[PDB]
From a paper:
The crystallization conditions of both proteins contained cacodylate buffer, which specifically modified surface cysteines of the proteins. Our current studies demonstrated that cacodylate buffer is an effective reagent to covalently modify protein surface cysteines, and that As could serve as an ideal anomalous scatterer in SAD phasing method.
When protein solution containing DTT was mixed with the crystallization reservoir, cacodylic acid was spontaneously reduced to a chemically more active As (III)-thiolate intermediate. The As (III) reagent in turn reacted with cysteines by a thiol exchange process, resulting in the formation of a cacodyl-cysteine product.
Numbering used by the authors:
A (entry chain A): 31 to 175, 197 to 292
B (entry chain C): 31 to 175, 198 to 291
C (entry chain D), D (entry chain B): 1 to 4
The structure:
Amino acid sequence: FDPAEKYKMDHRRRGIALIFNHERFFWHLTLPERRGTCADRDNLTRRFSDLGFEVKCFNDLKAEELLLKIHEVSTVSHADADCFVCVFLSHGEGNHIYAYDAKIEIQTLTGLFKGDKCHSLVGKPKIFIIQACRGNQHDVPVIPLVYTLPAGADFLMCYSVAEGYYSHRETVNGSWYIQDLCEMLGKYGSSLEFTELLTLVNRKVSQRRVDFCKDPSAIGKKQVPCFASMLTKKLHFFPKS
Amino acid sequence: FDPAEKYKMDHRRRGIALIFNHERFFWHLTLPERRGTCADRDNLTRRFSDLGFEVKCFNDLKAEELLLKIHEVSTVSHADADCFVCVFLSHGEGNHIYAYDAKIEIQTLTGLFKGDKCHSLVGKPKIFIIQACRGNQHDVPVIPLYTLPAGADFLMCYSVAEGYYSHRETVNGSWYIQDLCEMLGKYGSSLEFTELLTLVNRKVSQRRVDFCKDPSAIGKKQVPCFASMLTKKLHFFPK
Amino acid sequence: VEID
Amino acid sequence: VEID
Ligand SMILES: [Mg+2]
């Protein structure tokens, strides 16, 4: 048993990174526009491309369209890929995100990549990154003082914020979380173990605060991200040969 | 910005580790006894004691009693502690675990330790470990081809991913606690804690239901899942 | 082996 | 800063 064991990332391709970018919504949902989400989209495209990913992006897909795209990707062979990345940039609440016209439960999307549903990703990291609100709590600032495999294994769920909370987005620079994630990917993405990198992102985002707000009660509010690992090995994105 | 920053673990005390150990349940909940759970309790007690924790166990508490005890602990000062650990060994489903007589939502327990509610743990790891089922799915085997947020610095360590059954051997204890304890014994005092939990993920993922009265359940599986809101590297070097 |  |  080797504590240092890493996923094998020596396939022909790094893999696909999908980005679902949601800026506007069907009017009946009365959801505010997400100005600045395009900065996130571009930032992620740059940083994930630099790590070898084939980045694909889609703007404001309706739920039916999004579900179709996601099904298609879970159906193609990932046999010659190291891993799979899927990013959602949208509104959300509870355990769901919004497509243009309706909410989708996040489990509906991840389920399509479980081992029995997607054989060609078995044993490979399946990474989901979600920038979206997760409820209506606004975090407050405080100060100190050989074997078979489970079909559920090797997922990494990376959320911009802990369960139940608002997540923050700058209208020009993009979201707090995606900015900090991309900064870390840019500097450390090709060397640092990815959960270590996500931990640095937790620290970066935790340092931010709402500096100005039309609602004075929101001034100084906070956000801590949260990632869930079902990974079984160390994960790196060393430059591919 | 230091990419290698570690939590300060040089306080007078490591901290408290609570273990809520549930073997039997009020008859009307129609829950089976959990043989092997006191083995988990003793195993954890040994490993966490070895890492410097002050371990306190409570057995088959009713919900009211459990809530009282957790509130009590969240109220006492942890100023001179490195961190706090809280373990639940029980049945569960959805987002709850069972006390003797009733379910408790996990968020009810963790909320008491958020930064605004427990000032003396602000900036310190708050580690929850939950051995319990989380739904009615039985995983199948496959083969390969600055201020701080009040929500920060939690680490939620689940024996299994969301929605799934978790497994317990009637003599040796649960898969997850056995493997967690084995890894604590070997690596607890040296490796980064999330790195160690990842090893646990691999260990548990290697296990399978080798024998079962229900033939359909033979070979079924389990992957654990940990959620980190940690902001630094976490080590338990000898104090 | 039992189910939790 | 806006809320998501
Ligand atoms: Mg302030």
